[PDB]
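Hi again,

Forgot to attach this to my earlier email, sorry! This is the prediction with heme-A bound. I've pasted everything inline since the attachment limit keeps bouncing my files.
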Amino acid sequence: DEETFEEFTARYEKEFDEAYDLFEVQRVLNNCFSYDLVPAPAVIEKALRAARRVNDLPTAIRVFEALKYKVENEDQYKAYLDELKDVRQELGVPLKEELFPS
Amino acid sequence: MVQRWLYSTNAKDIAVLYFMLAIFSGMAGTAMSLIIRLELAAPGSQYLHGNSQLFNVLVVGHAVLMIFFLVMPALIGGFGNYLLPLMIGATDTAFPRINNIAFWVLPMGLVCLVTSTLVESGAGTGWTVYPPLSSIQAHSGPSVDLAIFALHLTSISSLLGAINFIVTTLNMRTNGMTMHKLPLFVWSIFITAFLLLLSLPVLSAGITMLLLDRNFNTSFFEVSGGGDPILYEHLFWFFGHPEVYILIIPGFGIISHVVSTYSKKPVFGEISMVYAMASIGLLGFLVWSHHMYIVGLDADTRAYFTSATMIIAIPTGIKIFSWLATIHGGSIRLATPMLYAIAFLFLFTMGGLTGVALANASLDVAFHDTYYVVGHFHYVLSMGAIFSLFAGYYYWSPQILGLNYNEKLAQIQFWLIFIGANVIFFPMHFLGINGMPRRIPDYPDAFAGWNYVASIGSFIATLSLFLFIYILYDQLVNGLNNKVNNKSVIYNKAPDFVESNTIFNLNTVKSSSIEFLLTSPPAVHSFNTPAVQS
Amino acid sequence: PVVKTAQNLAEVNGPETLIGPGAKEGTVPTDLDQETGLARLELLGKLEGIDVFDTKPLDSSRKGTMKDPIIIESYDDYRYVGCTGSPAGSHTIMWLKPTVNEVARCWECGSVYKLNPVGVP
Amino acid sequence: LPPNALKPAFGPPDKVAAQKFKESLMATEKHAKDTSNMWVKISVWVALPAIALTAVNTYFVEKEHAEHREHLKHVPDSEWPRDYEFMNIRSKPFFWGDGDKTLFWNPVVNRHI
Amino acid sequence: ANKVIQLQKIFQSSTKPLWWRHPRSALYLYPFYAIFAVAVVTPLLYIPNAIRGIKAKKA
Amino acid sequence: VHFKDGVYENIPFKVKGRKTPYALSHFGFFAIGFAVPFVACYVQLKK
Amino acid sequence: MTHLERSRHQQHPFHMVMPSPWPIVVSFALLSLALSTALTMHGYIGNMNMVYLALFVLLTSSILWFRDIVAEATYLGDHTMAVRKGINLGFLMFVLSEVLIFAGLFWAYFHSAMSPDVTLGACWPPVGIEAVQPTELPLLNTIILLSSGATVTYSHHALIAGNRNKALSGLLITFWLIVIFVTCQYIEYTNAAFTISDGVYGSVFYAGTGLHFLHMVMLAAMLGVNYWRMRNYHLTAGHHVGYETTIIYTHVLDVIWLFLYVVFYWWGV
Ligand code: HEA
Ligand code: HEA
Ligand SMILES: [Cu+2]
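Structure tokens for the complex follow:
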């Protein structure tokens, strides 16, 4: 019924205010990526900081490779490339130089 | 210690016992159908010295045994008494005495039908018992009376079970559960039970009338004496077609439950198709007479019947597309339930295609009683019942036992039954277009190669049944090994690329009921507290 | 072996101890002592409201988060409950498993539920 | 004095649902009593006289018009109904019993020897 | 009455199967419903014992 | 009547037994799987 | 242990069961009936009393089991609203099934209204055959049953309201009327109309009456077993099972019997 989508976003931030472990990060990431909506860099950075609140680099790998392979969206690459480049340069998580040469 | 297996007040023991009885009847029917197909493998008398009387005796035994003792008892009783009062939060189901009485009147039916099949005269009129085809002059002895008694007691058992299910649904509902948003399984069982309650009594009355005709030698449906057997023919149609719905709709609910608990996404148009299934249950009393197009009804009556029979056919395609959307956009796993449901849906699409081909009345004149009609209902009944039961077993065995079942054995089993069914059922199109004449112990040898491939497929099915029993032995002997190693599937659904290993370990199943994470069936006192839901 | 007044809602224990004296002549007595078994306690409870095996709804409307998790009044070790949102319905029901050995999570509310004993000596 | 430690979970506080159920049960009982009274009154007023009149006239007509079959055993073959293949046809041979080889000793069904 | 209480006390002080209720009826029924049941069941399927041995052989 | 954990006792058969370690009863099940059609044929015809 | 006590005496209505072979001996008696019927179909001995004795002992066994089970129901106690409501609902379902059987049997001979047959009849009545008319034989029985139903339409409710000497008088008159009914049914037992062997034209009404008399037979049997249960001092004004059914028995019986009496006696003659 093309319901509102920002309500679930606000639910994500209010659970972030109530976040108590990496479990909530997993739940909110699954809920957000399940939706058809493409996450803006703001909510992507919010999810990244939620995952880093426990400082788990594997969760950073998860979220980055999920952004790289979230939705086909008629095969959107260049936007994905620039977005991953900036969300990498903000903190620095070099991992594509290891799994790709396999 | 024997009261558990003779006076089971709990539903689970009765469920597994009905399952054992149904599987025994099914394996016996499969073996004797293999024997029949071997008789029909080549024209003549190679293993049985003709005996068309005996031929039709085993033919009717085939039909009656699989219809009345394989599809019916387990497929409804086990799933109903194991889920319908358990998921709703009820502590224990009522009427244990009724279920025990039904069980203990069943062996009357088994023994009487065995005696009826094992007399010199015997009843061999097939699934149709319309007089004077079912007259005592040809099929003498006590076979007809024993068959009638078995019919009566089986109808009583099924009707009482449906009554128990209905009263459990109507009264034992938990406080925190709306009626409009019930699961598809609950509504499926509801519609099936109500259709059974409105269909079985009519057939029971007709069967009682035939019993009175055979005993008191009166004149109701005999041609001599101004009788009208077409009344009982219409009664049998208004039983069978709603009985076909009774056999199929719980399979639809089971497939819906499997896809909902596996695909991890909601079923498209869930409430809309709950309403559609309610409409099907309400309107099933109007499309029961699309088989009698040649009896001599009026042209306007033919038009009404055909209009109804293709105006109530849309929800089949609606369900097909709804389940297609349910598996669309989600994650599908290379598991046996997925492939079982896919094969069942595909072969059901072909079966419904053949039925729609049969929906026309003008084509029926040259198509009725040809090979096409029997091929069509063999398609729909065979795939529906057999694959629904197989999917239910392979989807519910760890739910009721907790001992894992081998993935490799299940996959090879599926491949065997699937290839057997395809090789048997593909040539039926050519067989129908040529006009193979049905129910002939010595058919013309033109169809020799097709009979050979049908026999090969039947023998493949029988060795598949041997694989079934060997798989049961393997599970019983190595469930501990299956739990220890990875030779068997451990979890129903694979994780997505969002879940950490620990999180998925502590969130193994997120379904609509606690049954999956309910421990292996507890003692007779389970669900001591009501189920709360919001 | 003495007669029991049975005037208290909690002092009666054991349907065997209750028999119920008969009457010689008169009218049918009220539904206080003529009933046999323990059905009289149950019918009195439904007459007044104080009931065992109560079907009254729990705090389903309450979110039941870590600030104030929902309560369950039962001494049984296992738990068969569910909670998928404060309103009447917003998502498919998922069962909750309160326990003392470990913690529980809701996957939509993220609530840690604590099973609630009854006071014992 | 039964041993009770704290309380046997008396339950949630009461509400008006119990009294509503009480009112419904009392209304059902009162409806049953009222329909009993009214139906008994109307029955004894009208039905019993009408039922008695129907019974007596039916008994009279049965005593009058249903007593001519006593002499059917002995009758000349002059007013016999026009029969056909409906009667006088072969049936299953019967071997049980001794008397006339018949299921019941009613030698009146067939008047032809 | 004067016997219901005594019977209840006996049952409470002695829990045994068969309900200790119909001993004479049990002795009249169960041994009879065994011996007479055998005597009425066995001959029906023992009459064809002489005919038993059919090999479906003809000349 | 309430002493069934429900792990291996749900089956209406006894796993224990040296004479029948699920070997004699299940061989009887094997026999009765094809027994009824064979005897039905044997009553009137030959197999 | 108060919570344990409430969860064990209120949420656990389970009754202990010892390995009693009653169900298997009941099934054995049923198999005995089946083999007796098979022997009637084909047998080498011409005796008739053996099958009658087998049927009689089976009926006595069933009646004994029913009176026994109601005896343990009234005797073990442990009765709540759950057991009473469940047994009442089950008995209502059973009487509804009996009503549906009555309706089916009525429609079995009711369906000849438009006369859709083809030959040898096809216009009721099929004039041309002068057989024995079934009409006017059981009208005395149906009218006296109508009188009994009229007088007991609310006599059961009067009994449940009073439970006094008037209840005893009602039970006595019920016994007398059912005895009169069974005697007037027994008077025409063998030589009622003729032997049912050949030439059927109007035996359908007689067959219907004969099959309908059976339910009245077990009605009398259940009334007698209820009276004997009161003679055993088991069915008091507690978890009543006889009363809870006999209150609605007349209301569910009179409707269907009036349906079967307005037609099938005033029609088809
Ligand atoms: C219930 C529907 C149904 C099903 C499933 C089948 C299944 C089959 N039928 Fe039959 N058939 C009928 C309904 C059905 N049939 C009817 C109504 C007739 C007409 C009756 C007549 O007029 O008398 C008929 C007639 C009929 C004939 C005509 C008889 C003739 O005159 O010679 C033939 C011919 O060979 C035949 C063959 C088959 C075959 C090969 C299968 C194969 O599909 C069999 C494969 C089945 C199995 C796979 C069973 C597996 C067994 C198990 C152990 C189950 C395990 C499950 C669990 C409990 C977990 N059928
Ligand atoms: C599983 C049960 C089942 C199902 C689903 C069907 C489905 C259908 N059946 Fe069939 N049928 C039987 C069970 C079943 N049947 C049995 C046992 C018999 C034998 C009885 C007797 O005759 O002896 C029988 C026989 C039978 C006959 C007897 C032929 C003759 O008179 O002798 C006819 C005739 O019209 C018929 C019609 C149909 C139709 C129109 C459908 C349709 O409902 C099919 C629905 C599916 C489709 C709709 C196709 C897929 C979806 C789409 C492509 C959507 C778009 C298409 C359209 C809406 C046009 N069936
Ligand atoms: Cu149809």
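Chains A and G do not touch (no CB pair under 8 Å). Residues B 244, 248, 290-291, 293, 309-310, 313-314, 316-317, 320, 349, 352-353, 355-356, 358-359, 364, 368, 373, 376-377, 380-381, 384 surround heme-A (ligand 2) (CB under 6 Å).

That should be everything now.

G.
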